[model samples]
Target: GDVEKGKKIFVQKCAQCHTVEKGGKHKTGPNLHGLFGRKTGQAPGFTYTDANKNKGITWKEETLMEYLENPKKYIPGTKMIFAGIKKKTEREDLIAYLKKATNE
Candidate 1:
């Protein structure tokens, strides 16, 4: 997966709501800084739905892969409103980008 391509994907599909930079403001969705290893719904300032808070899943590359493929199916009643990414390569690229962007 290409990180550059992933970034493009983010701009196209995710940036409308998500901000990956550290200390970035929350938009329609929470800022995704430190997303890779954090627990679901744990971003400090954003209020999360009970389903997300109660899912109790940690964010990891494998888990993120599944979640990004189908966010609602992975966590029912989640507030993230985007339709899941159907392409495996796109998901991989996006996760790769997130791993870099969210942490740095």
Candidate 2:
């Protein structure tokens, strides 16, 4: 998984709604700072659907791998509108970059 590639994928696909920087503004989706260890739907100030708020899953490399592949399938009632990243390599890259970017 390449961080640079991951970042590129993020900019192309996820930047419209999600921001990875610490203290970044929330867009359509919540800012993803500290995402790796935090629970889903816990980003302060962001409004989440009950499906997301009650999913009760922690974010981690493994969990993100599955979720990123198909967010709708992972959480049936999520408000996120993206279709999802189908390529495994892209998901890996995205997660690798996110692991660093969100924590920074």
Candidate 3:
């Protein structure tokens, strides 16, 4: 239920730029198909900023939590333009969905 809830939020907020399904094409941002546990800026075919390319981030639970709260703060000079997610539960469920959906 919460996963679906998170999906709703993601569709409303993130789907404009991100695709949660693997093998999907890139949008305004790279596809978020397999996001968790993946290296930042390493998604194939997606252009990334220098900040993201050099940061060498390994996305997981806590890192995603912080970055979701503030993408610019986590990685300065990132290309993503969205400010951030403000609500706690929404973030939690979203992260939960990412973790589950991205698991291979």
Candidate 4:
């Protein structure tokens, strides 16, 4: 998937709450620039659901796919309120660029 498309969706959909850039300010959700590899619910400053807090996760691409497909299913009571990405291709595209939120 093209990075531009993903970037667009991220900005229009997820950016209102979550951020990809390192040190980005929190509005409603945690920064997701490095979200892929991070353990579940471990992003600094944000509180997490008990389910995610104790998951002891090290995120893998597959893990990301599963969770982004269904937020509540992945981490019930999670602070994230945005619904999961429904399209696999969209999720894949977004995940492809998710690192840019921090790596820039």
Expressed as tens digits, the lDDT of each residue in 1-104 for candidate 3 is 26777778778878888876776667777766676667878766777876887788898878887888898887889788886887767788888777667664
Superposition error at 88 for model 3 (Å): 1.8
lDDT digits (tens) for residues 49-82 of candidate 2: 8788788899898888888878887799978787
CA error at residue 76 for candidate 2, angstroms: 0.9
- Residue-level lDDT of model 1, residues 1-104, one tens digit each, is 87899889988888899877766668888877777668878766978786887898888888888988888877889787788888989988888888788766
Ten-residue region with minimum lDDT total, candidate 1: 19-28
TM-score of each: 0.90, 0.90, 0.87, 0.80
**Candidate 1 runs further than 4 Å off:** none
Better of 2 and 4 by lDDT: 2
Kindly give the stretch of ten consecutive residues in candidate 2 with the minimal lDDT sum.
18-27
Candidate 1 pairs with clashing backbones: none
Error of 3 at 101 (Å): 2.1
**What is the TM-score (0 to 1) of candidate 3?**
0.87
Query: What local lDDT does model 1 show for residue 34?
Result: 77
Better by TM-score, candidate 3 or 2 = 2
Write down the RMSD of all candidates, one decimal each.
1.3, 1.3, 1.7, 2.1
| Total clashing pairs for each candidate | 0, 0, 0, 1
Residue 63 of model 2, lDDT score: 83
> lDDT tens string, model 4, 1-104?
55688789778878888776766767777775566567766656766556776776777667776778886776676666677888888887776776455434
Model 3 weakest 10-residue run by lDDT: 95-104
